[PDB]
Design an enzyme around this catalytic site. Structure first.
Site, PDB file in Angstrom:
ATOM      1  N   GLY A  78       0.804  -1.255   0.000  1.00  0.00           N
ATOM      2  CA  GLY A  78       0.000   0.000   0.000  1.00  0.00           C
ATOM      3  C   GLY A  78       0.825   1.288   0.000  1.00  0.00           C
ATOM      4  N   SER A  79       0.201   2.388   0.368  1.00  0.00           N
ATOM      5  CA  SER A  79       0.773   3.704   0.211  1.00  0.00           C
ATOM      6  C   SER A  79       1.631   4.142   1.411  1.00  0.00           C
ATOM      7  CB  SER A  79      -0.355   4.749   0.018  1.00  0.00           C
ATOM      8  OG  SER A  79      -1.083   4.526  -1.189  1.00  0.00           O
ATOM      9  N   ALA A  93       4.006   8.022   2.273  1.00  0.00           N
ATOM     10  CA  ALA A  93       3.908   9.411   1.917  1.00  0.00           C
ATOM     11  C   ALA A  93       4.505   9.630   0.552  1.00  0.00           C
ATOM     12  CB  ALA A  93       4.603  10.283   2.941  1.00  0.00           C
ATOM     13  N   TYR A  94       3.612  10.055  -0.385  1.00  0.00           N
ATOM     14  CA  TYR A  94       3.975  10.514  -1.739  1.00  0.00           C
ATOM     15  C   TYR A  94       4.410   9.380  -2.650  1.00  0.00           C
ATOM     16  CZ  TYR A  94       4.658  14.916   0.899  1.00  0.00           C
ATOM     17  OH  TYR A  94       4.528  16.010   1.741  1.00  0.00           O
ATOM     18  N   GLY A  95       4.009   8.158  -2.340  1.00  0.00           N
ATOM     19  CA  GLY A  95       4.292   7.038  -3.232  1.00  0.00           C
ATOM     20  C   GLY A  95       3.966   5.662  -2.662  1.00  0.00           C
ATOM     21  N   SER A  96       4.029   4.659  -3.536  1.00  0.00           N
ATOM     22  CA  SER A  96       3.802   3.266  -3.213  1.00  0.00           C
ATOM     23  C   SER A  96       5.041   2.605  -2.601  1.00  0.00           C
ATOM     24  CB  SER A  96       3.453   2.475  -4.455  1.00  0.00           C
ATOM     25  OG  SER A  96       2.215   2.861  -4.992  1.00  0.00           O
ATOM     26  N   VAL A  97       4.807   1.718  -1.634  1.00  0.00           N
ATOM     27  CA  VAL A  97       5.854   0.987  -0.972  1.00  0.00           C
ATOM     28  C   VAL A  97       5.730  -0.506  -1.235  1.00  0.00           C
ATOM     29  CG1 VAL A  97       6.806   0.359   1.298  1.00  0.00           C
ATOM     30  CG2 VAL A  97       6.128   2.732   0.794  1.00  0.00           C
ATOM     31  N   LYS A 140      10.270   2.652  -1.357  1.00  0.00           N
ATOM     32  CA  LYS A 140       9.239   3.578  -1.782  1.00  0.00           C
ATOM     33  C   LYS A 140       9.622   4.248  -3.092  1.00  0.00           C
ATOM     34  CE  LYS A 140       8.428   7.519   0.562  1.00  0.00           C
ATOM     35  NZ  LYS A 140       7.925   8.249   1.764  1.00  0.00           N
ATOM     36  N   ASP A 155       7.875   9.506   8.683  1.00  0.00           N
ATOM     37  CA  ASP A 155       7.036  10.538   8.040  1.00  0.00           C
ATOM     38  C   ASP A 155       7.088  11.920   8.702  1.00  0.00           C
ATOM     39  OD1 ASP A 155       6.349   8.647   6.060  1.00  0.00           O
ATOM     40  OD2 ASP A 155       4.276   8.420   6.722  1.00  0.00           O
TER      41      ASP A 155
END
Ligand SMILES: Cc1ccc(C(=O)NC2CC2)cc1-n1cnc2ccc(N3CCN(C)CC3)cc2c1=O
Length: 341
Positions: free
Chosen positions: A27-28, A30-34, A49, A160
């Site tokens: 899933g997501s 901060a500011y991108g997919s992991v 990420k 984060d």
């Protein structure tokens, strides 16, 4: 230069060094997919990420720069740090993608649902991490269970931090854990916004309930003042906003609750530390360093193993640059990255 390979993973093309294998969406971030991945070089499990369109705009580009700089500076056990940063780009002119590699902790506090001892250890780690970032004048601003990463050992790192806007960055905060002062902009803020968050988190660990589950800014404020009482003249003096003072004095005047009635049968020291975290006045809220020396943390506290950070240069934050200037600055930071031992 390492060998890269490509792989479609849910919408987009991931291109990563072969040292990283078995990529697996989680899933997501901060500011991108992991993705979780296996690092064949170290035998570690890692989070990778891929930033989403890092250089599409001034906001994305600056924030790519900010995140990278943050990560490269953090060397502390309770704070996430940078294992690796890569791009498939061979030069600046095709630099369009940034991948960030950290440790993979395996869960978070948002999943967790805890005896007094677990709360001690866990909050101790938050505060220790907070002491470290606060010392470099970095503030989280949106500390919350979902960004407190923990492993099955109860070891904890904060993620984060430094991303949520100072006073746009595209970062989406969670209302329930925000210091009332930065939600209602009603008075200047400082590092202790995060201590309020710790208060809300610590409270949830002990009771199982979200402390302040408001449906909007005003409801939320209503829930906060129900606990802490409407402020007297001392605090009301410190608020500029005509309208913020209106709200406070218009809701029927609430008395401060007894914190022992709310956090039933909790360690009295736990209760006491909560009383010092969840005060409305930011100038009087306990800091991370002072909270470490609180009696509640006596089995864990060690003045010689609670380090501060080296000076962090964030003069860039006040700069209005073009996308390509941010991009070159990011690329420099990528090329000069040295892994840890
Ligand atoms: C890779 C990375 C890079 C940078 C940063 C970072 O804190 N940057 C700021 C400068 C401090 C953090 C991470 N990171 C690390 N481990 C994770 C592990 C798991 C997850 N999910 C697990 C749960 N799912 C529903 C949702 C997501 C995301 C992450 C994750 O975003």
């Amino acid at each position: 230069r390492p060998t890269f390979y490509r792989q479609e993973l849910n919408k987009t093309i991931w291109e990563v060094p072969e040292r990283y294998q078995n990529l697996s969406p989680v899933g997501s971030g901060a500011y991108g997919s992991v993705c979780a991945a296996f690092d064949t070089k170290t035998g570690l499990r890692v989070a990778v990420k891929k930033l989403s369109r890092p250089f599409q705009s001034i906001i994305h580009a600056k924030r790519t720069y900010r995140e990278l700089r943050l990560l490269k500076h953090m060397k502390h056990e309770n704070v996430i740090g940078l294992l690796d940063v890569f791009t498939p780009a061979r030069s600046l002119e095709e630099f369009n993608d940034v991948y960030l590699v950290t440790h993979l902790m395996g869960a978070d506090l948002n999943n967790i649902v805890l005896t007094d001892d677990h709360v001690q250890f866990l909050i101790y780690q938050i505060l220790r991490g907070l002491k470290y970032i606060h010392s470099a004048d970095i503030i989280h601003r949106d500390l919350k269970p979902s960004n407190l990463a923990v492993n099955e050992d109860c070891e904890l790192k904060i993620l984060d931090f430094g991303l949520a806007r100072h006073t746009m960055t595209g970062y989406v905060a969670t209302r329930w854990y925000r210091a009332p002062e930065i939600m209602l902009n009603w008075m200047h803020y400082n590092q202790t916004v995060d201590i309020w968050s710790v208060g809300c988190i610590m409270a949830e660990l002990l009771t199982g309930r979200t402390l302040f589950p408001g449906t909007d800014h005003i409801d939320q404020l209503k829930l906060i003042l129900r606990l802490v009482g409407t402020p007297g003249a001392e605090l009301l003096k410190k608020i500029s906003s005509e309208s913020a003072r209106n709200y406070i004095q218009s809701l029927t005047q609430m008395p401060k609750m007894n914190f022992a009635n709310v956090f039933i049968g909790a360690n009295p020291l736990a209760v006491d530390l909560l009383e010092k975290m969840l005060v409305l006045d930011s100038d009087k809220r306990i800091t991370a360093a002072q909270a470490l020396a609180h009696a509640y943390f006596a089995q864990y506290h060690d003045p010689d193993d609670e380090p501060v950070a080296d000076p962090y240069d964030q003069s860039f934050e006040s700069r209005d640059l073009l996308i390509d200037e941010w991009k070159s600055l990011t690329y420099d930071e990528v090329i000069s990255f040295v892994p840890p031992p």
